[PDB]
Design a protein around this ligand. Structure first.
Ligand SMILES: CO[C@@H](Cc1ccc(OCCc2nc(-c3ccccc3)oc2C)c2ccsc12)C(=O)O
Lengths: 8, 254
């Protein structure tokens, strides 16, 4: 979850 | 402690979501109406410029709305007291399993029995146009109105909703949570402040609290059914890609 981790 | 929790969640909500219930209700009762294919194409020239069969284009525009909402929900979540202190893998897990529940709870605010707002309230798409879509695209639309008409009869306001969406995110039984204890304690704090808020905001709706608890499990089912249609669409429509953010969220769901 690269992009979710990216947001967080 | 938490005599300040409700204020912080409410402020985070108004600060992070471009659309809210007051704005939505005011706009609903002027927006460009999409009611047929020719108005769809107009709206696509006028409203959706930056964002090819029709249903697929509509599917695409819906998912752009989810990507942006997920972006707002992440920022809202970081402002919930306690959340930023969780392990980053837990933060990911909570947003992953919670965003769509939150999305459909909030989408309810821009929907009425006849259709819903689009493009930041600059448009309105009718329920009948959505029903005229070919399957499976039509099928992701109507169950949301079914849910929204009933959730909207509860007449929540933005402050109730902010607490409700916070409760949905900080949810202690999501799969694979590294630290259930800390998350369950965030949850109890929020659900406690919610309970008290509904009591003082809606003094004559004795069962609103339990009713909302029920709306939580209903949204769960709602997302499971939605995720299943999106998986069908993904495997059987060669022209419908899922945005990579949405694809991570949906991976492993069942
Ligand atoms: C593909 O579904 C999305 C979730 C979703 C996200 C957003 C949604 O509604 C957004 C409102 C909306 N806007 C449009 C639209 C159409 C053409 C041009 C511009 C806009 O259609 C709708 C229903 C809906 C409605 C039913 S499901 C859903 C997802 O899975 O990410």
């Amino acid at each position: 979850h690269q992009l979710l981790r990216y947001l967080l | 402690d938490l005599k300040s929790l409700a204020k912080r969640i409410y402020e985070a909500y108004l600060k992070n979501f471009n659309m809210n219930k007051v704005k939505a209700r005011v706009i609903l009762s002027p927006p460009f109406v999409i009611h047929d294919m020719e108005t769809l194409c107009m709206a696509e020239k006028t409203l959706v410029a930056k964002l090819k069969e029709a249903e697929v284009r509509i599917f695409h525009c819906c998912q752009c709305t989810s990507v942006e909402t997920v972006t707002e929900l992440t920022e809202f979540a970081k402002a919930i007291p306690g959340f930023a202190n969780l392990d980053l893998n837990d933060q990911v897990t909570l947003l992953k399993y919670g965003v769509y529940e939150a999305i459909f709870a909030m989408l309810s605010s821009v929907m009425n029995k006849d259709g819903m707002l689009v493009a930041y309230g600059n448009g309105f798409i009718t329920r009948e146009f959505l029903k005229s879509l070919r399957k499976p695209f039509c099928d992701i639309m109507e169950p949301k109105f079914d849910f929204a008409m009933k959730f909207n009869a509860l007449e929540l306001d933005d402050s109730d909703i902010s607490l409700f969406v916070a409760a949905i995110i900080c949810c202690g039984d999501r799969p694979g949570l590294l630290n259930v204890g800390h998350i369950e304690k965030m949850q109890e704090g929020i659900v406690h402040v919610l309970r008290l808020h509904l009591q003082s905001n809606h003094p004559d709706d004795i069962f609103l609290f339990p009713k909302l608890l029920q709306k939580m499990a209903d949204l769960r089912q709602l997302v499971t059914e939605h995720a299943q249609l999106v998986q069908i669409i993904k495997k059987t429509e060669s022209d419908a890609a899922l945005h990579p953010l949405l694809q991570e969220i949906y991976r492993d769901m069942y």
